[PDB]
Amino acid sequence: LTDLPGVGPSTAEKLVEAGYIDFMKIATATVGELTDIEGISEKAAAKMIMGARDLCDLGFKSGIDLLKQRSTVWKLSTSSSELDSVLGGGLESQSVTEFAGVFGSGKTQIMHQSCVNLQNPEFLFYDEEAVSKGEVAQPKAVYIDTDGTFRPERIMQMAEHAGIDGQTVLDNTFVARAYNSDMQMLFAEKIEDLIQEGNNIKLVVIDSLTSTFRNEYTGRGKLAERQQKLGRHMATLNKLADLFNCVVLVTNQVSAKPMAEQAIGGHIVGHAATFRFFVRKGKGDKRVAKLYDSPHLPDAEAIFRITEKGIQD
Numbered sequence: 001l002t003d004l005p006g007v008g009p010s011t012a013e014k015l016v017e018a019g020y021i022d023f024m025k026i027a028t029a030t031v032g033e034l035t036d037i038e039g040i041s042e043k044a045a046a047k048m049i050m051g052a053r054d055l056c057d058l059g060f061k062s063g064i065d066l067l068k069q070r071s072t073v074w075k076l077s078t079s080s081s082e083l084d085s086v087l088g089g090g091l092e093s094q095s096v097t098e099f100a101g102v103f104g105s106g107k108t109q110i111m112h113q114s115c116v117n118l119q120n121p122e123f124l125f126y127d128e129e130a131v132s133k134g135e136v137a138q139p140k141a142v143y144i145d146t147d148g149t150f151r152p153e154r155i156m157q158m159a160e161h162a163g164i165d166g167q168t169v170l171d172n173t174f175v176a177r178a179y180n181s182d183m184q185m186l187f188a189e190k191i192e193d194l195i196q197e198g199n200n201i202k203l204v205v206i207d208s209l210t211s212t213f214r215n216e217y218t219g220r221g222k223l224a225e226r227q228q229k230l231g232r233h234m235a236t237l238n239k240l241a242d243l244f245n246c247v248v249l250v251t252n253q254v255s256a257k258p259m260a261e262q263a264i265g266g267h268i269v270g271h272a273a274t275f276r277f278f279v280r281k282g283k284g285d286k287r288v289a290k291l292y293d294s295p296h297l298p299d300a301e302a303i304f305r306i307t308e309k310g311i312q313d
């Protein structure tokens, strides 16, 4: 931390206690939140930010560099051949991909299946030139359980059918039961602490994402307040995926209001989610994921199934 211009081991011991220990946390901070710290002046704060953006090389980039930045984004397999395809390879890190859909369409299954596929190194697709082996070594997931539907059994079950060891997944997956939007938001904010303690968090799950905000901000004369609180949440979730190069998955419910339906969460959720899906039930265990929004990929459908082994085909 003293590598930073104008940073005595004091101002450093201070920054660590205030949470800022990473050059990025500091490079992407504001001169206001940084001065909120004691002996940290304005020029002191202004200087270490400029210095960290610098050390981290956050300037203008052109040509081949645009490709090298893009190559830093690894991807997680959904165990579905078709879903990965439609996903442009798999679930991307540095982005928030959402799965919305009717009850029992498999949203939760996808969240569990992921926590498992993370513990299998051959399910993390990356370019060894931009993503080192150590950067994805001993990955860990973080399952923020909103509905109260996390199921250890299911994690164990999906683990064997894939050769993986069940306890091994449970030992590397942190679960946080949130009973309201408050606990929900705060848990997501406290993922930074899990990292500061050496946990290679490479997967974040919010299931469900909107349930809480709706039960709380009922009156739609309160919806302004909601969309506001809900916008900072999505912001935190994205900075996370960006800064810790991990994938952020979230599930969402569908509103009756008119395809036919639409994911709840309002505008803010739409703008904030990078990849948006609509999952449907088919005959028996046949399911369909429909990609309707993304920045570079074309809308498309993926067929898979939900069996005792999890997601397959």
Ligand SMILES: Nc1ncnc2c1ncn2[C@@H]1O[C@H](COP(=O)(O)OP(=O)(O)NP(=O)(O)O)[C@@H](O)[C@H]1O
Pocket (backbone or CB within 6 Å): 102, 103, 104, 105, 106, 107, 108, 109, 110, 157, 306, 307, 308, 309
């Ligand atoms: N062990 C299992 N073997 C086979 N199928 C299973 C198993 N466990 C769950 N399922 C299937 O998973 C389906 C439900 O998927 P699930 O992801 O839990 O719903 P959801 O998408 O989260 N819907 P919702 O709760 O409304 O948000 C069930 O109805 C079962 O057919």
Ligand SMILES: [K+]
Pocket (backbone or CB within 6 Å): 103, 104
């Ligand atoms: K249900």
Ligand SMILES: [K+]
Pocket (backbone or CB within 6 Å): 147, 149
């Ligand atoms: K539910």
Ligand SMILES: [Mg+2]
Pocket (backbone or CB within 6 Å): 094, 095, 096, 238, 241, 242
């Ligand atoms: Mg991003």
Ligand SMILES: [Mg+2]
Pocket (backbone or CB within 6 Å): 107, 108, 147, 149
């Ligand atoms: Mg569910």
